[PDB]
């Protein structure tokens, strides 16, 4: 499978979701952390890696990054979470700010399993401006995941 | 080996809840592609 959208993706202790990834213009988009570069399986069936970066904790298959919107700073985002064995929400939010010595990125305060890291945070016209997943631990305990986008 | 399975479309949803905050934080992040709390 190809077609445009949000994809789960598992692992054969049963069957477990490791990570949340996209398909858009016959490229899968997900987080490095989920498969660690391996190759991942649509049917019978292979999707191979492209691209990849530790350090942006991105990587691509079957192509290159297409993901090229990023947010404006100022109007709300919407988290299309795809927790394990729950049907995909979505969740609005106002971001948050990470203050880098590279520049600052942005940050939503949701929390959820490790299993829903690789999901796609959109803008207001369903444009993926980056995946939720990798972000701190703050002093309360919470988690606040960075909106980490790559480069098309 | 991994595999993957559709979760739906990417579209925006006009009434959806809204949750979260908006934290302002200092980060540093690492050669390994972690962030930490500065």
């Known amino acids: 499978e190809t077609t445009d959208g949000v994809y789960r993706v598992m692992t054969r202790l049963g069957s477990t979701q490791v990570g949340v990834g996209v398909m858009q213009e016959g490229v899968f988009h997900t987080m490095?952390?989920?498969?660690?570069?391996?190759?991942?399986?649509?049917?019978?069936?292979?999707?191979?890696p492209y691209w990849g970066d530790v350090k942006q904790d991105l990587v691509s298959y079957c192509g290159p990054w297409k993901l090229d919107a990023a947010?404006?700073?100022?109007?709300?985002?919407?988290?299309?979470?795809?927790?394990?064995?729950?049907?995909?929400?979505?969740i609005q939010?106002?971001?948050?700010?990470?203050?880098?010595?590279?520049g600052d990125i942005?940050?939503?305060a949701l929390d959820?399993?490790?299993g829903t890291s690789g999901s796609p945070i959109l803008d207001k016209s369903g444009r993926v401006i980056g995946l939720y997943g990798?972000?701190?631990?703050?002093?309360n305990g919470s988690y606040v995941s960075a909106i980490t986008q790559g480069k098309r | 080996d991994m595999?993957?399975?559709?979760?739906?479309?990417?579209?925006?949803?006009?009434?959806?809840?809204?949750?979260?905050?908006?934290?302002?934080?200092?980060?540093?992040?690492?050669?390994?592609?972690?962030?930490?709390?500065?």
């Open chain 1, 93 to 102: 939010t106002l971001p948050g700010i990470f203050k880098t010595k590279d």
């Open chain 2, 3 to 38: 595999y993957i399975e559709r979760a739906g479309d990417i579209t925006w949803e006009k009434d959806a809840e809204v949750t979260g905050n908006s934290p302002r934080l200092d980060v540093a992040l690492d050669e390994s592609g972690d962030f930490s709390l500065v």
């Open chain 1, 112 to 114: 959820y399993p490790a």
């Open chain 1, 71 to 90: 947010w404006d700073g100022l109007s709300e985002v919407q988290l299309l979470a795809v927790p394990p064995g729950e049907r995909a929400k979505n």
């Open chain 1, 32 to 48: 490095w952390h989920v498969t660690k570069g391996a190759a991942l399986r649509s049917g019978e069936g292979r999707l191979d």
């Open chain 1, 106 to 108: 942005g940050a939503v």
């Open chain 1, 134 to 139: 990798n972000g701190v631990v703050i002093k």
